Structures are given as C-alpha cells and as structure tokens.
Curated annotation (Swiss-Prot), chain A:
Coiled-coil segments on the chain, per record: none
Gene: RPL19A
UniProt protein name: Large ribosomal subunit protein eL19A
Domain of life from the UniProt record: Eukaryota
Function: Component of the ribosome, a large ribonucleoprotein complex responsible for the synthesis of proteins in the cell. The small ribosomal subunit (SSU) binds messenger RNAs (mRNAs) and translates the encoded message by selecting cognate aminoacyl-transfer RNA (tRNA) molecules. The large subunit (LSU) contains the ribosomal catalytic site termed the peptidyl transferase center (PTC), which catalyzes the formation of peptide bonds, thereby polymerizing the amino acids delivered by tRNAs into a polypeptide chain.
Modified residues (Phosphoserine): 28
Species of origin: Saccharomyces cerevisiae (strain ATCC 204508 / S288c)
Region (Disordered): 1-22
Compartment annotation: Cytoplasm
UniProtKB/Swiss-Prot annotation, chain B:
Cellular component, GO annotation: cytosol; cytosolic large ribosomal subunit
UniProt-listed GO biological process terms: cytoplasmic translation; maintenance of translational fidelity; ribosomal large subunit biogenesis
Other observations noted: There are 2 genes for uL2 in yeast.
Gene Ontology molecular function, alphabetical: RNA binding; rRNA binding; structural constituent of ribosome
Gene that this sequence comes from: RPL2A
Organismal lineage: Eukaryota, Fungi, Dikarya, Ascomycota, Saccharomycotina
Identification of the protein by name: Large ribosomal subunit protein uL2A
Family: Belongs to the universal ribosomal protein uL2 family.
Cross-referenced InterPro entries: NA-bd_OB-fold, Rib_uL2_dom2, Ribosomal_uL2, Ribosomal_uL2_C, Ribosomal_uL2_CS, Ribosomal_uL2_dom3, Ribosomal_uL2_RNA-bd_dom, Translation_prot_SH3-like_sf
Keywords: Cytoplasm, Isopeptide bond, Phosphoprotein, Ribonucleoprotein, Ribosomal protein, RNA-binding, rRNA-binding, Ubl conjugation
Curated annotation (Swiss-Prot), chain D:
Predominant cellular place of this UniProt entry's protein: cytoplasm
Record's keyword annotation contains Mitochondrion: no
One Pfam family named in its UniProt record: Ribosomal_L38e
GO cellular component: cytoplasm; cytosol; cytosolic large ribosomal subunit
Native organism: Saccharomyces cerevisiae (strain ATCC 204508 / S288c) (Baker's yeast)
Molecular function via GO: structural constituent of ribosome
Family classification: Belongs to the eukaryotic ribosomal protein eL38 family.
Stated name of the protein: Large ribosomal subunit protein eL38
UniProtKB/Swiss-Prot annotation, chain E:
Gene Ontology terms: cellular component: cytosol; cytosolic large ribosomal subunit; preribosome, large subunit precursor
Protein name listed in UniProt: Large ribosomal subunit protein eL34A
Name of the gene: RPL34A
Alphabetical list of PROSITE patterns matching this protein: RIBOSOMAL_L34E
InterPro entries linked: Ribosomal_eL34 (IPR008195), Ribosomal_eL34_C_sf (IPR038562), Ribosomal_eL34_CS (IPR018065)
Transmembrane domains' residue ranges: none
Keyword Ribosomal protein: yes
A molecular-function term among this protein's GO annotations: structural constituent of ribosome
Keywords associated with the record: Cytoplasm, Ribonucleoprotein, Ribosomal protein
Family that this chain belongs to: Belongs to the eukaryotic ribosomal protein eL34 family.
Subcellular location as annotated: Cytoplasm
GO biological process, one term: ribosome biogenesis
Subunit-structure text: Component of the large ribosomal subunit (LSU). Mature yeast ribosomes consist of a small (40S) and a large (60S) subunit. The 40S small subunit contains 1 molecule of ribosomal RNA (18S rRNA) and 33 different proteins (encoded by 57 genes). The large 60S subunit contains 3 rRNA molecules (25S, 5.8S and 5S rRNA) and 46 different proteins (encoded by 81 genes).
Amino acid sequence: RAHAQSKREGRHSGYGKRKGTREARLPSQVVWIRRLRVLRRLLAKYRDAGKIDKHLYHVLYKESKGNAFKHKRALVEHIIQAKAD
Amino acid sequence: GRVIRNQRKGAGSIFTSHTRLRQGAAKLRTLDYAERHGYIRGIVKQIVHDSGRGAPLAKVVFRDPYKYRLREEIFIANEGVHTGQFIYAGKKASLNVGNVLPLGSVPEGTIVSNVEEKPGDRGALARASGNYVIIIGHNPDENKTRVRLPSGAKKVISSDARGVIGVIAGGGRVDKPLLKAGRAFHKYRLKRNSWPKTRGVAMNPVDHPHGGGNHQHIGKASTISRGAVSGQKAGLIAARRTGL
Amino acid sequence: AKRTKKVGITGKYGVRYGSSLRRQVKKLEIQQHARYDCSFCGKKTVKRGAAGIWTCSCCKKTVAGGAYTVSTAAAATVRSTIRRLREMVEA
Amino acid sequence: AREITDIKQFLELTRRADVKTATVKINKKLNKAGKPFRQTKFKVRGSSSLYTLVINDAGKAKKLIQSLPPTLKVNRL
Amino acid sequence: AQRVTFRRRNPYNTRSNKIKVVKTPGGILRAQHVKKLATRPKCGDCGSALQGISTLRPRQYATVSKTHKTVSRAYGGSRCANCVKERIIRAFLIEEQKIVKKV
RNA sequence: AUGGUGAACUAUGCCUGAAUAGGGUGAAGCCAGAGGAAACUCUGGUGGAGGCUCGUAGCGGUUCUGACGUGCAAAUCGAUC
RNA sequence: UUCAAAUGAGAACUUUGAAGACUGAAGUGGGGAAAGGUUCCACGUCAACAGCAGUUGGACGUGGGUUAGUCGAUCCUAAGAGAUGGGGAAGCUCCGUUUCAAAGGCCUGAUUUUAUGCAGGCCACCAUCGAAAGGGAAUCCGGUUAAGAUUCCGGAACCUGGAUAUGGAUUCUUCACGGUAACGUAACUGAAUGUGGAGACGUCGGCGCGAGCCCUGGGAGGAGUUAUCUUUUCUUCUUAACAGCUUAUCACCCCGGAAUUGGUUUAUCCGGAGAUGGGGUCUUAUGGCUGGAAGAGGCCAGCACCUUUGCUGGCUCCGGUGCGCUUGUGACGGCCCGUGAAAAUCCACAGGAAGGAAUAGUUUUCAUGCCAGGUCGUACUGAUAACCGCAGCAGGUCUCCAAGGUGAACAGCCUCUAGUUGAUAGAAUAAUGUAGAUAAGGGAAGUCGGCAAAAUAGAUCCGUAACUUCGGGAUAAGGAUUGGCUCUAAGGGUCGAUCAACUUAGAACUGGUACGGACAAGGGGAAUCUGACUGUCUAAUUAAAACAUAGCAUUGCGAUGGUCAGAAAGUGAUGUUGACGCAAU
Ligand SMILES: [Cl-]
Ligand SMILES: [Cl-]
Ligand SMILES: [Cl-]
Ligand SMILES: [Cl-]
Ligand SMILES: [Cl-]
Ligand SMILES: [Mg+2]
Ligand SMILES: [Mg+2]
Ligand SMILES: [Mg+2]
Ligand SMILES: [Mg+2]
Ligand SMILES: [Mg+2]
Ligand SMILES: [Mg+2]
Ligand SMILES: [Mg+2]
Ligand SMILES: [Mg+2]
Ligand SMILES: [Mg+2]
Ligand SMILES: [Mg+2]
Ligand SMILES: [Mg+2]
Ligand SMILES: [Mg+2]
Ligand SMILES: [Mg+2]
Ligand SMILES: [Mg+2]
Ligand SMILES: [Mg+2]
Ligand SMILES: [Mg+2]
Ligand SMILES: [Mg+2]
Ligand SMILES: [Mg+2]
Ligand SMILES: [Mg+2]
Ligand SMILES: [Mg+2]
Ligand SMILES: [Mg+2]
Ligand SMILES: [Mg+2]
Ligand SMILES: [Mg+2]
Ligand SMILES: [Mg+2]
Ligand SMILES: [Mg+2]
Ligand SMILES: [Mg+2]
Ligand SMILES: [Mg+2]
Ligand SMILES: [Mg+2]
Ligand SMILES: [Mg+2]
Ligand SMILES: [Mg+2]
Ligand SMILES: [Mg+2]
Ligand SMILES: [Mg+2]
Ligand SMILES: [Mg+2]
Ligand SMILES: [Zn+2]
Ligand SMILES: [Zn+2]
C-alpha cells in the first residue's frame, strides 16, 4: 500500500524502472479508442443541445476520425472559432 | 523386391476417398415419362460448396408426378444459375441456360455440360469446373448425335441422351498458383491420400524399378510397353513420343 | 499515406515464393475479394463465398460464377451463343 | 418456493384437503426509514409446493391466526 | 482463492462439461454444471429468427404450453410475418394472371 | 517348408475430442490533410494480414564428442540449442 | 535439519509440542480418464519385506466399509464392423449390406357365441454391433462416518410413464377474444398425408456486457504489535437448485418522406427496395427484487460440567473502482483450389378425415390433486511408493480449478492458503575427480578447428551500408540515457459544481559517478561452397548438401476405359469420380 501511494504521486516511473515497451505498458490502440470516444461523445452532446447543427456536426464527425484534434480541448476551441466566423 | 507403391493402391485400405463432407452424388433426374414427352419445372433452392469438388452444386426441387411430395435433386451448377430460378427439364424444354434437354432437340453449336454417355445414366461428360461439350452435328438416321469432348476427341452419342445447357461454373480455378506446400496439403486432405509423392529414383531397388545406384538415375528407358505386368508399369506407359 | 510501392495485398507473403508467382496471385486476389454490382437489386453488395459462389448481402440472392470473378469471359460468350441460337428456333 | 399476496387465496389453500401442516415465522426486521417492526410469515405445505404469505402488519397478523382452521396442524417458530 | 473441481467423472473440457462458479449459503465456492444454451427457431423461408417464440432445448418444448410455441397468424411459429405477406400477395396475383391467360 | 499369433510400441489414412504466456514487425481496406491545369503524387492517422519474427508451456534433440558408462536408466542426467 | 517430552527391552528415523526451512497456484495443493484391485478404515502385531534402523508402514493377522427415477452405463449414430437373400470355394470358409428375394406391422372398422377371425387404407424405410471426452428427458443446499454420499438424513424441487376428479376456460353464431400492425394471453377440438425448425457444429482478431476472483472506503466483532510510532496489521460480515414479477444488443411494426445527403463503428457500412426522428413489438444469454431463507451457515459474548454433554444471548450491514485475471456470451471483421459430422429424439405449421351443444359436452398443450420409476458401476491410488518399465527404478503416462508483490509476462525471485520436512548416518577436510567460481601482464601465440569459456543483453532517444524478387536486409553497423526525493504540465466521467483512473513529457535537489544495481537478458562484420524458403527421416553412434515442397514438363485414358486388387465370384480401390479429372514418371 505504501509503494502504491508513491506510484500515485509519480515516483518509481523513470527510464530505469521500465522493462516492457511503451506499447506493452499501454497499447496505442487503447489510447486512440479513449480519445475518439471522447470526441464523438462531445459532438453528439452539442448537436442534441442545439449548439451545433447537423451540417457542422457531420463535418466534425469525419475530422475527428481523421486525427484532426489531439484532445477534447482542441475540439471545443475549433467549434468556437467556427461559430465566431 | 517388395510390392511397389502403385500396386498397393488397389487394395483400398488407406487410399480410399474421403467422403464425410460430400453433399451427395451429383446426378440428373431419372429419365421418366415427363422428361421423354414434355417438360417438368424445378426451382433452385440453394447453391452450395462441395468438399473435394471445385465446381459448386445446386439443389433443385421437383414435384413428384405420382405422389404428393417433393423430390430434391443435386445438380452441378452452370454459370448464370441463381437461387429462385426455374429450371425446365424434358424434351420440350426451351433453349436456356440451366435447362436439361435431349441432345437431338438443340441446334448445332449448342454448348452443353453434364452430358449423358447413354440415355439414362444421369450425366457422365463435362462435369469438372469450366468444361463443356460442343454439339457439331446430327444424324437423324439411326438417331445419333456427334459432339466434341473437352479433351478434343470426337464422339458419336445417342440423340436421346440428355444434357444441361451452359458451362460448368467455377472456371479459371487452376490459373492461381498454390504457392506453398500447405495449400496442396489442404487440397488433397478433402480428396484422398496421394500427396506428397516420393520420387522413385530416391528409393532403393527393393522399393522401385528406378531405385539404387551410386547416382540417382533411371538406368533404362522410362517408356514402358502396354503389355508389361503389374510392378513394371512405372514411368511413361505406352508413350507414342517423348520430349517437349 | 501509400504504404507499399507495388506488392499491394501480396505484402503478407514477405520475400518468399518469387516475384513472378506473387504477381500472378495479386491479380486474382484482388478480383476475388472485390465487391460487385447485383444484377437483381442494383447495389454493390456481391462478394464471394466459396470458389464459384457469389452472394449479395442484400436481397439474399446467390449466383453461380467463376472461381475468382462473378462472370468469366467464356461464360459471357456462351450466353450470346445460346441467345443467338434460341432466336433461330422460335422465329 | 411460491409466494402469495392475496389473503382470500390464502384461506382457500388452508382447506384444500391435501394440506396437513403449516408454520408461522416471526422476523424482527427494519422498515424503509424507521425503527424495526415485526414481520410474520404464514407457510402452507402443499403436496408439491410451499406457499408463503408475508404480512408486515402485526395488528392484521393476529386476526389471521385466529381465523385458521382448527384441524390444521400449526407449527410455531 | 478457493479452487473448484468437476462434480462428474468427466475430466475433460467438452461442450457437455461446462461449469460455472457459484457461492453457496455455506460460504464456499463450488462448481455448477450448466447445460448448453438454446437456439432460437428460424423461419422456413428467409432463415431469420422467429419473433414471439420461446428459446428452449428441443425436448423442453413438450413441457410448455402452445402459447409459447406459436403466433396467432397463418404459419405462426413456422414462417415470419414478412414471408407470410409475400406468400399471400404472390398467390393472389398469380391466380388472377392465370384467368387472363385462360381468356 | 507347413499351419498359426500380433498395430497396447511404432508407420500412414480415417472418425470423434482436447491443448497452445507476453512481445517485435505493421500487408489490404478506411479517414483527414497537402501539392498539381489534368492524370495523379506525397504526409499523418486508422486497421491488424503472414506455412513472418523474439520468447514461455508444449514438441524436438545441435554441441559439450560434459555426467554416467557392473548407471537412477538395456538410451538416462546437466548445460547449451 | 535441531531441542524437549511421551511410548518402549531398545528411538538420528514412531507420536506430540517448539524452532528452522521448502514446494510458491503450469505446486511437493485440490479432483479425475486409463491401468491396478482392497493397497481404503479400525484393532492387534514385528520372523520376513521397507539395500541403515524401526515401537512405524501401501508389511503380517483379524474384522469393518462402496446405498442414486435426476451422476454414468443402458438409447443414438461416426469412421468402421457384420447376419440374412444370393453367388464363389474340395473345404476350413470368401464376397457383399439393399444387394436379380413372395423380406414387415399400428390406427381402427367390423364382433357383445370368443377372442380377435375377418372389411378399407396408411406406410416399404427393409438385421444387428460401433463413443464412461460426440448426440442426450429430469436435483439442489445444509448436516452426518474410524472409513460412505449431487447416492444416507432434514428441508426444498424437477422429469418420464400411467391413472383419474374438481375448479377454471369454451358452446344456443358449436370448436376463445384483444391489437392498424409487429403481436399479446392461464386455457382457447384436428386423423392420413405433406412441409419447416430445433438436435447441428471451423479458426483467428479487436470491441461491448455478465459471473467468480483481485484491489479498496465506512461501520459492527475477534486476534497480533505497542521503549517509541501506527484512528494501525491480520481475520468474519455468506445465500443453492427451483419459482413469480421484471430486465436486451440484434431484429421487427406504425407514423412520416430525406441533397444544404444524413446517420454511424475501435474497425465503413446503411437509406425512395424508405434514412434520421417520434411512438411501439419481441428473443430472456444476463442482471435486479421477492419466495426458497435464516429456522441454515459464519463470527462473538455470558453460563452450567466426569458425564448421555448442551443451555441463553447478540451481530451477520452499507459502498467504490478497472486496457486487471480467469471464463461465459453478444454483435461484427479477416482467412481458404480447406467453407469446417450423422442419427435417435422433440416441436410447429399446411391440410380437413372424424367427433361433437340445451337441460347438455369436450378440453388432461390452464390450475390443483393420485401412483410408480428396475438392472450394473460408485471404497482408494492416480504416481520420485498403489499404473508400465524384473523393484518402493531421477524414465514413461490424457485432462479441469489457479492468491499477493516485483515485472511486458502462466519468465526468474520472495510470500499467504494447503501439503511435505521424505532420499543410511557420525567424524575429518590428503591426492585425483564431478559440479560451481576468480585471476596480474599478454590476448588464439593453444588446437584439425576459438572446442570450452568470456564478452553482448531490458527499456527510451539518436543513427543505420552493400545488395534486393522493392516485400526486405535491420535490433544492420554505431552512440547516449536509466536511482532516490520534492514539484510542474497535459491527457477524463456524471450533472459552474462534484467524483474517479496509471500514462507520458519536463524541471530543481541529492550520492564514494551509483542506478534494466539481485533476478532476467542479441556478440558483430567482410566473403566462398551448397540447399530457394517453412517443413521431414536413420526410436538406441549419421539432422545433412539427403527427402518433401510450390513451380515446370512429359505419358496413358471418353467408361464395352486407364491404373491397380483378388484362388474364385451375380468380387473390389480410384469413384458420392468424368480431362480445370483420375492415374503413371
Ligand atoms: Cl513405395
Ligand atoms: Cl481433431
Ligand atoms: Cl539436452
Ligand atoms: Cl580436488
Ligand atoms: Cl535458387
Ligand atoms: Mg491505434
Ligand atoms: Mg496500431
Ligand atoms: Mg537412400
Ligand atoms: Mg526390382
Ligand atoms: Mg526394368
Ligand atoms: Mg457424453
Ligand atoms: Mg493405436
Ligand atoms: Mg503416405
Ligand atoms: Mg521463431
Ligand atoms: Mg560424451
Ligand atoms: Mg565410473
Ligand atoms: Mg526454489
Ligand atoms: Mg520459497
Ligand atoms: Mg493406511
Ligand atoms: Mg533394512
Ligand atoms: Mg531390522
Ligand atoms: Mg462377411
Ligand atoms: Mg449400440
Ligand atoms: Mg470419500
Ligand atoms: Mg469416491
Ligand atoms: Mg506389470
Ligand atoms: Mg511385464
Ligand atoms: Mg587474465
Ligand atoms: Mg587484467
Ligand atoms: Mg595457430
Ligand atoms: Mg602449434
Ligand atoms: Mg561455443
Ligand atoms: Mg533446406
Ligand atoms: Mg514460423
Ligand atoms: Mg540415431
Ligand atoms: Mg544426432
Ligand atoms: Mg532434394
Ligand atoms: Mg468405393
Ligand atoms: Zn442484390
Ligand atoms: Zn421469413
């Protein structure tokens, strides 16, 4: 339990403590699935709330699939700029 | 010496055909009153794969003329035949792909398949995928029909023999390289025990007429006469010529 | 991006079997794995099952065809020959 | 194995001509948001099934006991 | 960390030797042998599953009422509604077409 | 030479079952973006193919020509593979 | 391995207690298939056997022990085996399995002399054997013995076969009503014959969901530690078959009519052959609540006492988390010149032969009630001692369950549960060995030969040639970094607030410059001979350049046939086959 608390604070995680590859520790597909589900969940929420019409929703749906946005914050800012123009 | 490999196959112990997954024998309808006078209509219910056979098979259901029930037949499917299609078989059937007609009821140049050698044997000729028989003429006297066979030979067949209009489906199969020993393994796994094959010159004299010697060589002409006996017929049997 | 220059689908075989043999398999692998128009429902939903069997995802129609293509060149010629001969029997 | 919720149906089971035994169980349990109350279960032993009637009202429970047929063998706790 | 054992003499992991781990009122983990799952009845024409029909092992159908094994319609429990609709329309139109061919 | 007995080992086919961590590589198909008059050409992702690859259980048995060599053993033991 | 006690004539070896250790969940743990056959358990006992010992034992002597309508066998069929009818053979016998055969019996009507003679029709499938892992009607929990249990006891269920009554339902419109529909229900006639479904099925990949396990918060008990510290460490808090209600991705129905194309998966598929959207229907894998059921089981406290040994009290509650582990399952996707059993058995539908109501009948597919369920197997070992190897032999022998930490990991290393502590011992430390190791300077000078050994090794970042079938070569080659500690930034869910995961990057500080600190873990390069590759063989001296392989070519054959088998045959293999085939090189 004491060791787990140290790990939660960021300790024992340097290059000298890693034996598997980055993929073995955390698969890149798992990271992608988390991010795309985050982006798609936000787009449906905005469209249902009426903040975005279906025409702009469809454009942003295929941009997120095309790796246009690196995180949720980048998508929200892009929506604001699109609505500001 | 001992009994050679090609002699052991006739005993039929481990060299029998692997027929567990076969859909059934592919035959035409039994030649009956409806076929030889008029026609009878069937329906293609499904087109299915057959293990050990390149060409697909079609299941066609006909009504029993003399009993209230349905009779199912297994046909070798031709190109263009689809599920739900009506198939017409008999002397008075139309000239369409999939129909079964006597050879004397079609004009010259008609392409047919699953042709009967004799009327009623339910199909013997042009059964493999992509093969067909070409009708080249008729002889109304003596009721004979002249056709061309896939091997190129010319045969005289009775005009009452039946055949299916079209060409056997699945053609072009042998144009694709097998590319590996594994695919050859799975091919003959559904057919029979004949693969792989060990060369005779790699054996000992007790095993094969080509065996032995301080080098691998046949040592005598590989052209064997038609009159040789079992244990001698290894190589090129009754060869008229050799070379490229 | 473009991942391979010329091997295409035959990149799964690596460097084995020879280039000429891999080239021949490439032509027939693309044909057998493609989607074809259904002559019954008009959609592009026909794919091969076993060799010589072609089924449409819609409308549940199965058509007997070639080993790696829906229709071979020989089968097309046979249809024209039968159609020409049929027209000379009724009229 | 089977639970009944209608009291009128319960009395019909007690005189079904195949029922010979019954038991009464008292449970001291708590209600949704108050102090514990008294729960009683009336169990009728049929030929193939056991019927259980549960009533959470003590006042209504005592009346049911007095209404049971005398010929029925009743087991307490 | 309790470990379980088979409750029959079959020691192999076959389709008829499936088990599920359950916890008993005695507070221990014990293997529970489960039967193979049932398959829904299929339509006679299109082959899709039939709506409103119970999913049971073949022998268990004899132990349930007729309500669980049919639908209140022609060919109920044998053909689906859309396939029955096709049969009725096809039967009517063809029979009408036969009359106009007769005259 | 005559008449008999063996496929519980093993060889091969068939029928019906069961078994096989974690990694590397990243083929088709698909999405977005960039360049160009056009044909089309590049970039980033996605995807997870192979009688591919590192390496456990498993299967096999290269070397030390190691141990043993009236042995634990009429073929085994250890390391390496 | 050690100390002590007990027993005994006698104790390194038996029993008990204490201590030190190991197996470390792919076990030295807990069950089985085959094989063995009483080795199982108790009492008595030590001549022989346990290559020392023996008071002990799988030894010796005498007894005890295996309980089933629900678990298997029994039934079904698989590859295959094999009677009959017939044909061969001097003959023992051979062929063949639906075959050149007059190959057989259940629905009844007819009869109240008696039991079935006798009228139609139906059906022609035409022995039998073949699976303790395939198919398959039906059971669970708690308790109980020296040794038995899903088999005994208590409680609670279910199936099949057979008897029958009541209630309910239905009928004077004789064989039910509702919903536009998908369809719903406590029921709600149906012979021959026909059709359909279930039985019934490959493999790999990721994703969703369920169960058990793992981790964890609060609280109610018990135990450990306490010089000091620790609201702390460990442990208990459980819910079966079955039953009622309810619960679903997929699929389907109704309304409506779409380009400013929309919807939508991690994975690109769907829509005028009707999308999105709104409202509905259904499968019940699965979960929830309740009955079963707290009366059980579990954890504690207070009382009796040689004793048959109990008696009385409490508590057994409420949450969180996930690329976790194992396993089940759903919707999908990849692959084949490979497309991945059969039968018994059960149900539904189409059909309409018959039987039926008014002072009366039918439904045992609705509910309740009554009776029966035979035969054989069942103990135990399952292996460094119960099997096979001449044996209590380091060999061989099919399979299920699988905790914590480290770490990519079922690797190695340590620990909990459980199980063992068994292998003749004591003393000494010569040579020579077997096994494990280290060496100054030189660095293959050794040797047939770098044989053996050493060096390299994880991860992150940088960098990477000739050649090439353009796929590779490649971890090419060649470099740098890695601890601890204190911080910072970014990446989410539900509804401004609130809650919850280890992933990556960076910066100071710190040390005998150490940090994949044990464990774990590639030497590399330039060329020649040879086989293309993966694969295969001389069980027990040869693993290769040998065999095989894809590719290429040649030969025979159109069935009254090619190749091959047989003593013969009304006999066979290829052949459930037909030249894109079979056969021979
Ligand atoms: Cl041979
Ligand atoms: Cl198998
Ligand atoms: Cl070895
Ligand atoms: Cl020495
Ligand atoms: Cl070569
Ligand atoms: Mg990814
Ligand atoms: Mg990826
Ligand atoms: Mg040789
Ligand atoms: Mg010779
Ligand atoms: Mg010769
Ligand atoms: Mg079984
Ligand atoms: Mg054998
Ligand atoms: Mg062979
Ligand atoms: Mg390898
Ligand atoms: Mg040696
Ligand atoms: Mg010696
Ligand atoms: Mg160890
Ligand atoms: Mg240990
Ligand atoms: Mg004993
Ligand atoms: Mg002795
Ligand atoms: Mg002695
Ligand atoms: Mg016989
Ligand atoms: Mg049998
Ligand atoms: Mg026992
Ligand atoms: Mg037992
Ligand atoms: Mg023996
Ligand atoms: Mg022996
Ligand atoms: Mg030195
Ligand atoms: Mg030195
Ligand atoms: Mg030298
Ligand atoms: Mg020298
Ligand atoms: Mg070496
Ligand atoms: Mg080689
Ligand atoms: Mg490999
Ligand atoms: Mg050898
Ligand atoms: Mg060797
Ligand atoms: Mg060779
Ligand atoms: Mg045969
Ligand atoms: Zn279509
Ligand atoms: Zn349907």
